[PDB]
Design a protein around this ligand. Sequence first.
Ligand SMILES: Cc1ccc(C(C)C)cc1
Ligand SMILES: Cc1ccc(C(C)C)cc1
Ligand SMILES: Cc1ccc(C(C)C)cc1
Ligand SMILES: Cc1ccc(C(C)C)cc1
Ligand SMILES: [Ru+3]
Ligand SMILES: [Ru+3]
Ligand SMILES: [Ru+3]
Ligand SMILES: [Ru+3]
Ligand SMILES: [Ru+3]
Ligand SMILES: [Ru+3]
Ligand SMILES: [Ru+3]
Ligand SMILES: [Ru+3]
Ligand SMILES: [Ru+3]
Ligand SMILES: [Ru+3]
Ligand SMILES: [Ru+3]
Ligand SMILES: [Ru+3]
Lengths: 173, 173, 173, 173
Amino acid sequence: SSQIRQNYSTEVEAAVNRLVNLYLRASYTYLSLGFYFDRDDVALEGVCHFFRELAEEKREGAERLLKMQNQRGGRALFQDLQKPSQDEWGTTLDAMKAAIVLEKSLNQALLDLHALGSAQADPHLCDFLESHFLDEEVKLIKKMGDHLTNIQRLVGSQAGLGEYLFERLTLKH
Amino acid sequence: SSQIRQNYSTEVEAAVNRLVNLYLRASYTYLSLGFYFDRDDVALEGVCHFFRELAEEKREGAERLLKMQNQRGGRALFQDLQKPSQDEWGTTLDAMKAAIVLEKSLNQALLDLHALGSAQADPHLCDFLESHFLDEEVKLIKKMGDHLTNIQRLVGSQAGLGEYLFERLTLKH
Amino acid sequence: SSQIRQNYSTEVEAAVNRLVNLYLRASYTYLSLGFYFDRDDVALEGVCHFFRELAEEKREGAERLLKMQNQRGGRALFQDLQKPSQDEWGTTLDAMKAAIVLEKSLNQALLDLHALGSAQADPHLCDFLESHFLDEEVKLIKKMGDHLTNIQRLVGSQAGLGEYLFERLTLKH
Amino acid sequence: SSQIRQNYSTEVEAAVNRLVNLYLRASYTYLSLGFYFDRDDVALEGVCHFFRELAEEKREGAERLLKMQNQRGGRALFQDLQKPSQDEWGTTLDAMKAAIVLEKSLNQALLDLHALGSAQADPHLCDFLESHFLDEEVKLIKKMGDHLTNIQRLVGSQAGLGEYLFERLTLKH
Ligand SMILES: Cc1ccc(C(C)C)cc1
Ligand SMILES: Cc1ccc(C(C)C)cc1
Ligand SMILES: Cc1ccc(C(C)C)cc1
Ligand SMILES: Cc1ccc(C(C)C)cc1
Ligand SMILES: [Ru+3]
Ligand SMILES: [Ru+3]
Ligand SMILES: [Ru+3]
Ligand SMILES: [Ru+3]
Ligand SMILES: [Ru+3]
Ligand SMILES: [Ru+3]
Ligand SMILES: [Ru+3]
Ligand SMILES: [Ru+3]
Ligand SMILES: [Ru+3]
Ligand SMILES: [Ru+3]
Ligand SMILES: [Ru+3]
Ligand SMILES: [Ru+3]
């Protein structure tokens, strides 16, 4: 059973399992994005790398949530990971827009869980998401917004040229 | 416009701009305090340094707030910085009392903003001020209270002697 | 009072206090410029950094002037810092033009003070501004003129592309 | 004779020789001050050291002036060094007041020489005193003013105690 569970509602436990699924789905979406930019007919290494980095970050988030679930005496329950929404992701601009939409959705889910935990009187969950999730999301979304603005400025006139330059001069390590 | 703003009210955005102005005004007040203690007819180096340190700390606080404003998709709006309340600051005791009053006012403004963000359901702002502002203020106010007590104990009898000794033995690096 | 003041007119003392206010206002303007280029819908890091660097340089200038004021036995008097002339600063070209106008105004104020000190027979002030101010201004204005020329050359045709390239290849550290 | 003299008036040459004599006399005064504070019935090591430091600084100033005299093709002419104005120098307060009076007199002599060189159209002399003399004097006079203020604050009530504390906590290395 559990010998440790204290002040941890079934509602929060369920919400945490949903958040795990959302973070893993986000990770899977970023894996698809990464390999799309690795196609020989796409071939934007900086972009591929940006998304592969995010795949790992999202997986790490899911893992931290699962660790927290066990620390509180809750029980992890996994669901299917739905395949990403697209098989082909278009331009770097299209991809960055999809990424922002995805991150905003995770952020909203975190805000929904915080509003649950506060309604459940759960201070620990509240300082857990605080912390390794809400702040990280804000910073990442700002970075993505900065990127979108730069990508948009570079769309001429000459979209191909701009796409190459962004990958070379902003993204590539 | 902004492509990133999420769960960030116009009320909080305005409050953050006000807090920026308050921190910069505090920085300006500490600049005035610092140079006052640098006067040849005042000449208390430890005291000058204590206040110049605080001028930089307050400026840094304003800058962190401005960074947060942009991270959330809010827009910085600057107002005039009102000149400090005094041109001459009296004794080290007078100056330390004015500093405590000033810090208490910043702290109260932070508490007012936290009470706004909670009423706005904004967990990120709440863990932003938590964090790099509320705890810092508490520690600084305690230090100032400790200093005031020591300064007061040293006021004889022989105020000049006590003022010199505090600067030499507590404040001076 | 002062026990040290020698060959230091009330007119020069007042002029120095005005110059302090001008340098601090310039610092505040550069702070506004810096955070504008940090907006998610502007997002030009090299430009943000260029202006934040200048904010610190101008503050440092004000501080050197205040130190000199006390060394001569004059008394610092602070005035309000007027908010910057704009809330939004347009393009990198607009911003660099505003910066040049601002620096030229500081330079003119330094030239006005030198012409005062010479009319006051004050050699020390004359070799103080010589020195840490006039030469610095000339070098900075030349750098800004160089930047403006490069920015202008890059305005096509394709203004977005040129703005990105200047930030990436000239400004960004 | 000289094969190098250019734009160097007999009036400036004479003024430089007078300044040499003034700096050497100041050095001699500081030597007397230093050894007075070394008396077994005075015994203030920090004070003795402060003045012995100044004796060396003033001698170094005289030497720089003599070097400049030869660089310009002028001819050094030495006069008697008048013995210092006092044989006993009283308290640290009395001594610091005498030192400030002495430095102000050197500064005034430098200002008189600058006003000569400008009336002689001598830019080199003007940037020579600028430079290794006028700025040094301003800084030293400020330091002395700071010291006087601290000494005065310490005169109770209990003059002996204050004199000891200043020597221990401000002056002594
Ligand atoms: C942040 C980060 C992640 C992965 C790498 C690889 C390319 C070594 C570099 C930086
Ligand atoms: C905390 C602090 C800040 C500034 C200094 C300067 C004097 C080096 C030292 C310590
Ligand atoms: C000149 C200068 C000023 C600041 C920095 C930061 C980015 C380290 C670098 C260079
Ligand atoms: C500035 C100075 C001059 C002399 C000494 C001696 C005591 C070593 C130390 C410092
Ligand atoms: Ru790859
Ligand atoms: Ru990487
Ligand atoms: Ru919370
Ligand atoms: Ru100081
Ligand atoms: Ru310090
Ligand atoms: Ru809170
Ligand atoms: Ru930045
Ligand atoms: Ru830099
Ligand atoms: Ru000049
Ligand atoms: Ru000795
Ligand atoms: Ru020494
Ligand atoms: Ru001159």
